[PDB]
Amino acid sequence: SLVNRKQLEKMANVRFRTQEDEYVAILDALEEYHNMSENTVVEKYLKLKDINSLTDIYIDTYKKSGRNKALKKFKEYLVTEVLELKNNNLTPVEKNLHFVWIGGQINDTAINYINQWKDVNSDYNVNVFYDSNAFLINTLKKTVVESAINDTLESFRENLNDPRFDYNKFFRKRMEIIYDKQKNFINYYKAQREENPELIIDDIVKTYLSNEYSKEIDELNTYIEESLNKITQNSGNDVRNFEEFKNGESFNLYEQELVERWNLAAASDILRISALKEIGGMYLDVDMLPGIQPDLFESIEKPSSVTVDFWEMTKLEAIMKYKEYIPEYTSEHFDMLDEEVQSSFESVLASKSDKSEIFSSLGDMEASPLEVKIAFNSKGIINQGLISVKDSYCSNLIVKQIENRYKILNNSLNPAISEDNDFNTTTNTFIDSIMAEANADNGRFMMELGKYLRVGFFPDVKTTINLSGPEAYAAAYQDLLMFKEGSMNIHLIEADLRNFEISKTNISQSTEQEMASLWSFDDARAKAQFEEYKRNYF
Ligand SMILES: [Mn+2]
């Protein structure tokens, strides 16, 4: 239990000192808190936050007071009480599974993974959010990028052995022309939406592709038709009917990533947490699979010669090898096992008859109305999996985190692009404003924001992480545990964040597709990629 009024008066007692107005404010607030056993969890949290805020104002008011030590310990006590509130007051999690595939056609292996979730979760409603107006964004990005690569490679022309025409110069010029093409497109798009507001993204993109890159409108209509057909046959849920999202203050951010930057990952980041906040349930990336039944392989000890991750991949590859639920799944790891272990897998799996003996079911999940739960990998939290009751407190904190970081980004970015200038001068105005607005609390973050316009077209850019990805989740967690909003500099350690992990049993993250998805544009692959562009062009 949290300390009561008398107990804090004893902790925070200083002889011959009268009780100040602020102090009485703290003690009254604590007394009121212990009289809310019949209030909602959120209400109790808010009272704990009002308490913490009052305690801070007292500490700031009487800086060298003798009560500050006890009151600081009381702050710690408040954080612990919040953890107890989150842990001892659970609610049902709405039985929804949320996936996102936007900007193009969904491939067969994604639908195979989703189908696994469907098969062992018949009681859960499944949403695969898509954007029916924007099936061509990825196509636009691919063709603009390919055109930039050709322009740059021609730009090198004869001097290929000139050492100062290296991959760095290649990517700096390629970025320049990509930026020109991108702002050309954004201008045409805003012109069209002014001239004919009836038009949707794909009309504008299709006629743009026809005019500027000689693509065939008929082929693009076929591509749209087939993509729409495939996703609607697989639980498609159109984001253009997501009214709460369309009318909220994150929709313009979603469309910024979608149509201005062509970053389908950033847009999926924006959307998944709004979906979660409005509907509740569990969000998954399409390369995640259901958790394996815990006892399924209890009889097979993991050798010491293989890492934990190796063994996880092995389990899945065995299941797919002898049950064939997903065709063409890899066996790279399973095949490296000694013959005896291989047969242990084969026999355990021949023992089992129905997929429900291999994959577990989510069932009836419950969570705190304060929290959203996130997955973990060896590098920390990752939002490939999230669990939340509808309108949870943390889902609001995460939405606010993302909207505020975009506020900071766009406050400096929008003035620079408003002047029609090239990539380099635009970057200079933009970065100048960033550094002007930097301070100790947001320094690291701003250094990341600096690379915004290069996201997706340059090696070693980590802006999305800081803008819409895991950093905003960690920032929201800190907001909760600090009784504030707007954290920019994360000091929570892994033990703090573990208070929000999804049980390992609810997701299989070690899949073939996700190890594929784990590649980074690391500036060695940039070198290699340059080498197969000049090898593929000459
Ligand atoms: Mn992934």
Alpha-carbon distance of 530 to 171, in angstroms, equals 9
Cα dihedral 24, 29, 30, 32 sign: positive
CA angle, residues 303, 308, 310, in degrees to nearest 5: 80
Distance of CA 495 to the CA centre of its chain: 20
Distance between CA 434 and CA 413 in Å, rounded?
A: 8
For residue 475, count other CB atoms closer than 10 A to its CB: 25
Residue 390: exposure state from Cβ atoms within 10 A (0-12, 13-18, ≥19): middle
Q: Which contiguous run of DSSP H or E holds residue 282?
A: strand 281-284
Alpha carbons within 13 A on the beta-carbon side of 155: 17
- Token pair, residue 201, equals 């993204």
CA separation for the pair 515, 191 (Å, rounded): 42
Among residues 187, 292, 266, 255, which one has the least CA distance to residue 449?
A: 266
CA dist., res. 356 & res. 339, Å (int): 27
Q: In 90-216, where does DSSP find H-type helix?
A: 108-119, 137-156, 167-195, 201-213
DSSP 216: -
Helices 264-279 & 393-418 angle (0-180, nearest 10): 150
Residue 100 is assigned to a ligand binding site: yes
Among 278, 421, 299, 306, residue whose Cα is nearest residue 349 = 299
Q: Contact 180/424 with Cβ under 8 angstroms?
A: no
- Give the separation between CA 85 and CA 331, rounded to whole angstroms: 45
CA distance 175 to 155: 13
Q: What is the largest CA-CA distance in the chain?
A: 88
Enter the DSSP assignment of 498: G
Sheet holding 96-100, edge to edge: 236-238, 125-130, 96-100, 281-284, 380-388, 373-377
Q: H or E element: which one contains 371?
A: none
Residues pairing with 92 in the sheet: 366
- Give the CB-side neighbour count of residue 419, counting CA atoms within 13 A: 14
Find out whether 138 is annotated in a ligand binding site: yes
Helix (H) or strand (E) holding 474: helix 470-481
> Binding residue per annotation — 269?
yes
- Other CB atoms within a 10 A radius of the CB of residue 462 amount to 14
Tell me the C-alpha distance between 403 and 398, whole Å.
9
Answer whether 281's CB lies under 8 Å from 95's CB: yes
432 is in an annotated binding site: no
Query: How far is the C-alpha of 508 from the C-alpha of 437, rounded, in Å?
Result: 42
In angstroms, the CA 397 to CA 460 distance is 28
Helices (H), 34-107: 41-61, 68-88
**Residue 243 marked as a ligand binder:** no
DSSP string, 319-337: HHHHH-SSTT---TTGGGS
Specify whether the CB–CB gap between 374 and 388 falls below 8 A.
no
Task: Write the Ramachandran bin of 432: left for phi over 0, alpha for psi from -120 to 50, otherwise beta.
Answer: alpha
Picking from 417, 370, 416, the residue whose alpha carbon sits closest to that of residue 393 is: 370
Three-state SS at 338? coil
Rg, C-alpha atoms of the chain: 27
Residue 208, classified by CB atoms within 10 Å of its CB into exposed (0-12), middle (13-18) or buried (19+), is: buried
Closest CA to 497 of 520, 471, 462: 471
Q: Is 97 helix (H, G, I), strand (E, B) or coil?
A: strand
Query: Resolution of this PDB entry, in A?
Result: 2.8
User: Count H helices, E strands: the chain?
Assistant: 22, 8
Q: Which residues surround ligand 1, an ion (CB under 5 A)?
A: 285, 287, 384, 514, 517
Closest CA to 366 of 392, 385, 384: 392
| Closest C-alpha among 521, 530, 525, 528 to residue 152 | 530
Cα(289)–Cα(378) distance, rounded to whole angstroms?
18
Q: Please check if 309 is assigned to a binding site.
A: no
- Please check if 162 is assigned to a binding site: no
How many angstroms separate the alpha carbon of residue 117 from the centre of ligand 1? Answer: 16
In contact, 374 and 386? CB cutoff 8 Å: yes
Pairing of strands 373-377, 281-284: unpaired
408 annotated to a ligand binding site: no
How many whole angstroms separate alpha carbon 423 and alpha carbon 396?
35
How far is the CA of 147 from the CAs of 258, 448, 538, in angstroms?
A: 20, 28, 16
Cα angle: 420, vertex 426, 428; to 5 degrees: 150
- Helix 68-88 vs helix 41-61: angle between axes, to the nearest 10 degrees? 170
Write the CA distances from 517 to 400, 404, 419, 536, integer angstroms. Answer: 28, 28, 37, 24
Q: Is 270 annotated as a binding residue?
A: yes
| β-strand pairing of 91-92 with 96-100 | unpaired
Instruction: Give residue 517 CA to ligand 1 midpoint distance, Å.
Output: 5
Of 21, 9, 227, nearest to 130 (Cα)?
227
314: which 2 tokens? 């092995």
- Residues 6 or more apart whose Cβ sits within 8 Å of residue 42: 369, 370, 393
Closest CA to 141 of 187, 192, 170, 178: 178
The label of the residue with tokens 């429900």 reads 356
* Cβ atoms of 325 and 349 closer than 8 Å: no
Structural domains in the chain, CATH included, are: 4-89 (1.20.58.1190), 90-291+361-538 (no CATH), 292-360 (1.10.10.1780)
Q: How far is the CA of 288 from the centre of ligand 1 (A)?
A: 7
Query: What approach was used to elucidate this structure?
Result: X-ray
DSSP 224: H
Residue 27 vs residues 32, 47, 60, 84, 186: alpha-carbon distances, Å: 9, 12, 17, 21, 57
CA distances to 13, 28, 44, 95, 444 from 50, in Å: 21, 11, 10, 34, 30
Residue pair 135/157 in contact by the 8 Å Cβ criterion? no
Q: How many whole angstroms from 520 Cα to the centroid of ligand 1?
A: 12
Binding residue per annotation — 48?
no
Measured CA distances, 219 to 2, 192, 205, 206, 405 (Å) = 66, 22, 13, 10, 39
Token representation of residue 219: 């082929």
First to last CA, the chain: 73
In whole angstroms, give the CA distance from residue 207 to residue 222. Answer: 14
* Beta partners for residue 96, in sequence order: 125
Q: Are 213 and 143 in contact (CB under 8 A)?
A: yes
Rounded Cα gap, residues 215 and 104, in angstroms: 16
Residue 210 marked in a binding site: no
DSSP letter assigned to residue 153? H
Query: Residues 22, 24, 26, 30: what is their CA dihedral angle, to the nearest 10 degrees?
Result: -170
Q: Is the distance from CB of 474 to CB of 490 less than 8 angstroms?
A: yes
Compute the distance from residue 285 Cα to the ligand 1 centre, in Å.
6
Other Cβ atoms within 10 Å of 147 Cβ, number: 15
- 99, 286 contact by CB (below 8 A): yes
Ligand 1 centroid, distance to 286 Cα (angstroms): 7
DSSP letter (8 states) at residue 98:
E
Residue 138 Cα to ligand 1 middle (Å): 18
Q: 238 by DSSP, 3-state: which?
A: strand
Supply 73's token pair.
């310990």
Give the residues across from 283 on adjacent strands.
Answer: 98, 386
Give the Å distance between the CA of 375 and the centre of ligand 1.
11
Q: Is 287 annotated for ligand binding?
A: yes
The response to whether 220 counts as a known ligand-binding position is no
Residues in the chain: 538
Q: After which residues does the chain show a gap where C to N exceeds 2.5 Å?
A: none
Q: CB–CB of 288/508 below 8 Å?
A: yes
How far is residue 93's CA from residue 212's CA, in Å, rounded to a whole number?
A: 49
How many A from CA of 383 to the centre of ligand 1?
9
